[PDB]
Amino acid sequence: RLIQYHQVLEMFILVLQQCHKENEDKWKRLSRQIADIILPMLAKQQMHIDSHEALGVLNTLFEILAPSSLRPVDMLLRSMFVTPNTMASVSTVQLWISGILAILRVLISQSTEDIVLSRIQELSFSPYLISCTVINRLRDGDSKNLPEETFSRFLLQLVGILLEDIVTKQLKVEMSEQQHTFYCQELGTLLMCLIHIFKSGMFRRITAAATRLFRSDGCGGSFYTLDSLNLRARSMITTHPALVLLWCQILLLVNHTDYRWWAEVQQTPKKLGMCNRE
């Protein structure tokens, strides 16, 4: 009844860890009972996971759950490929992206690439789930293809949303300093997940799809282009050098070696200066 709070999630990690040793069939049953509650809540942004601590507790709970409870990833995928009821408020965007990050870490740490891509193929989520137009509608107001392409376009649209919210958002009008800190921590977790996906070698199909998308264009403005993301990242140099370096690592992981980005963040030649730029 109180599961939407991360302190209750800690109490459940304990309950689960002890029922694991008491009996491994009370364990799996309770793990199923918990996943079946949590995943729809994450889909609808009802969990209070708008903090670093709460997201970490959710991660370790997902790790403590019995694997059988998340074995068919149809539910994880249905609970991840969602849009929020609005993205005009910072808190809703943060809760939505936080639940997405939790489910995504689950997908890249407890499942394999082929299973996830097959299941995505069955339940045909579209890449246009969050297009630039859906994004711009949800920001103020409301209303075939390859599975790896859908997954990669989803993660890239998330990156673009997070960049736009970190760069173009006044620092105490719309969001507090804690909300800004969490936005940057969410972007860091997302970029680290992406680096693991492109660097580990266990997501070759997703990596190839992402390399194809990064070289693609704006389908009449339906998705974020690489130049748009890079223009947003170039403005984070003076404020968030760590996230910018993660973005550079991702650009190398997809072989974007254009000297429009590299000969400028490296200040390639032909007042003390800022330390973040250094």
Next chain:
Amino acid sequence: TKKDRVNHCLTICENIVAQSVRNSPEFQKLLGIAMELFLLCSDDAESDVRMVADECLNKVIKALMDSNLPRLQLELYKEIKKNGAPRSLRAALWRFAELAHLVRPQKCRPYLVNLLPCLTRTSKRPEESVQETLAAAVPKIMASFGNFANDNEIKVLLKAFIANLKSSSPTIRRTAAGSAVSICQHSRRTQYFYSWLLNVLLGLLVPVEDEHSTLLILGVLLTLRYLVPLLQQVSPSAEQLVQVYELTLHHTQHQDHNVVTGALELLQQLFRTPPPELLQTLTAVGGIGQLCRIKGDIGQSTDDDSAPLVHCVRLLSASFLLTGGKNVLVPDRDVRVSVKALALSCVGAAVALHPESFFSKLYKVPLDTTEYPEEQYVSDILNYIDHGDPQVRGATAILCGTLICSILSRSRFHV
């Protein structure tokens, strides 16, 4: 003879603090003489025959605090309910407020019910020292008893204090403002009562184009200055907060400089601790439109093409700080240094939210260029960096610091 009155009103305080025979009826009604006497030595015609009274009241209280607290509480509530002499009332009231937090949460409802009449009564008391003691006693009493009132009782106390907001005494107006805000704050339904008091105060000045006294205006502006800090996220809405901002902007134009000072202090508290929705309205370009002479058109807070803070800064500058020529400072005879310092502080607090306002031309539609050669800029308030009195040079320094920080924060150092 009075020396032995000091000796008696000190020896009763030498006896009861040391008997070890208490917790028995032989004590309570000797205490019923000690407290009724120490509170009588409190309204004495002689100075030190009252100071020994205060000292021994404090001794008897602090020595028997945990031992016989409820007895002392009743003994002080009685001399409050009596509505007696002023000095005795102050004594009993301030000593009862300092002990309110020691009442166990089963006697806060009887005590609140008994205290409501006494409080409404002593609010109608014309003495100024009584009003000071009440301004200090109302927050302490509410912070301990307000969770035990119903909304009707709280509204009774609130209407009891709203009346003093038109009083001619400044002490009485300040006590009213503070007591109303503190009553709203320490209530069960805090946000609803904040909105209720907002309704009452904005209703007290519904048409700004209508005579509203000078004393009522001062009282309402002070109450709003006290209430604005508490509005950091029914609940009060952008509608009435924007109406409060409009009221403040209108009353900075008043001809009485006390109303100008009150409105500048309200605008200061409103830019330094802005409710999160009024902030968004003031910084939004559409803004409110979507929901000492001026000499020219500076614009309207309802304009588009610019956020309302641009107009607010234009208003403050064109009113109290800039003539309209070029590097010409407004004399002190036209507007005093207090109003000038407060206007510079308000401009700094507004620039903290919206640096672009600092760079505006002083006038949207310029003054007639035949005689005024060059258009003045708001930024010329910086010429006050060498005004001549402190607190105006210091305010200009504060404004430069705030402006540097705000420009570096708005652009990502992409200055």
